[PDB]
């Protein structure tokens, strides 16, 4: 059962948490092909590993800049947690290493592209389609939270679609191991829970709020709280007034009312039955939770793939040459990486 599985998962996690993998490849073993996304501290590139011929996604982070912008702890969290977790809907870290200038995280290449792209392109997902992805997130948060992990950055741009049409969660940049409350103002404006914005101190219930936002956006085509600037979004979030599209089922609106609950003693995922309040909700009544975990459910959408290195499902980004300094930068800050 659930319990069994989760206890053995914790034992494997804690072992890697306490003795993380380090230095398992080097830069010249990969041929860099194209940028898959740029980000605050570098970029993610499609690469080909020369000795196996396999394609991977290499996340590159500039060390000096991470120190300058005071994101060291978050970066070390990201790698320390990603190397230790293992779950069917979490992207797999295959290699990690650092050089004079950069940190590198080499993950499995998820070739279906961001959920974001598919969602904007098609407009919105049907409820069965949104439910198929939402179930994977419910199971993944159950797993992460059991490990005392909070994820803190759910959004369609951090969810990739694999060749089988299942989700791969990526970007553990704000993931943190904490038993109770934490205080950092971080995440993505549309997805922030009211208690984050209100600087109250907060816990893993922020991930269940974010699920509420994700399910809304998947099914509506737009987020429940939107405006042109973050502060205008924050205002609507804290009001917590939510309006639902015409086409939302009654079950869907009732689930969302319980996830997008400003009040912590009332938010689903955070009550006495914990995740089970969500799994047992009527909107998920057709959902076969074990079949999902086992990936035996037919995906509603399968990405069109044209060969292992195909990037057709990603936008184009401006390329920039990867520079590596002949002087080591920030060695001590990133010793454990």
């Amino acid at each position: 059962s659930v319990k069994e599985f989760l206890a053995k998962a914790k034992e494997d996690f804690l072992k890697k948490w306490e003795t993380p993998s380090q230095n398992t490849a080097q830069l010249d073993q990969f041929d860099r092909i194209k940028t898959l996304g740029t980000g605050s501290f570098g970029r993610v590139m499609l690469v080909k590993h020369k000795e196996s011929g396999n394609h991977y996604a290499m996340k590159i982070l500039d060390k000096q800049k991470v120190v300058k912008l005071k994101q060291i702890e978050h970066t070390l969290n990201e790698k320390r947690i990603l190397q230790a977790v293992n779950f069917p809907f979490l992207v797999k870290l295959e290699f990690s290493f650092k050089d004079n200038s950069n940190l590198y995280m080499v993950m499995e290449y998820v070739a279906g592209g961001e959920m974001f792209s598919h969602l904007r392109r098609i407009g919105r997902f049907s409820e069965p389609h949104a439910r198929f992805y939402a179930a994977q997130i419910v199971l993944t948060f159950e797993y992460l939270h059991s490990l005392d992990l909070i994820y803190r950055d759910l959004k369609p741009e951090n969810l990739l679609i694999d060749q089988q049409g299942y989700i791969q969660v990526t970007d553990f940049g704000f993931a943190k191991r904490v038993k109770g409350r934490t205080w950092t103002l971080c995440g993505t404006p549309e997805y922030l829970a009211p208690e984050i914005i209100l600087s109250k101190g907060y816990n893993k219930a922020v991930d269940w709020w974010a699920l509420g936002v994700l399910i809304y956006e998947m099914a509506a085509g737009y987020p429940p709280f939107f405006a042109d600037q973050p502060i205008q979004i924050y205002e609507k979030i804290v009001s917590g007034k939510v309006r639902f599209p015409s086409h939302f089922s009654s079950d869907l609106k009732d689930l969302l009312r319980n996830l997008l609950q400003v009040d912590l003693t009332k938010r689903f995922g955070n009550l006495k039955n914990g995740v089970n309040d969500i799994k047992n909700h009527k909107w998920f009544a057709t959902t076969d939770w074990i079949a999902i975990y086992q990936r035996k459910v037919e995906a509603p959408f399968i990405p069109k793939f044209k060969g292992p290195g195909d990037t057709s499902n990603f936008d184009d980004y401006e390329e920039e040459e990867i520079r590596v300094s002949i002087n080591e930068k920030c060695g001590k800050e990133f010793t454990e990486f």
């Binding site: 912008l69 704000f174 103002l185 971080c186 995440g187 993505t188 737009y222 405006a227 042109d228």
Partner: peptide, 20 residues
């Protein structure tokens, strides 16, 4: 419509994170 107002807004593209 709400959809038209969203699509005419400034935040329909990939959204960056915030950390302060």
């Amino acid at each position: 419509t709400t959809y038209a107002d969203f699509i005419a807004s400034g935040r329909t593209g990939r959204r960056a994170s915030i950390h302060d």
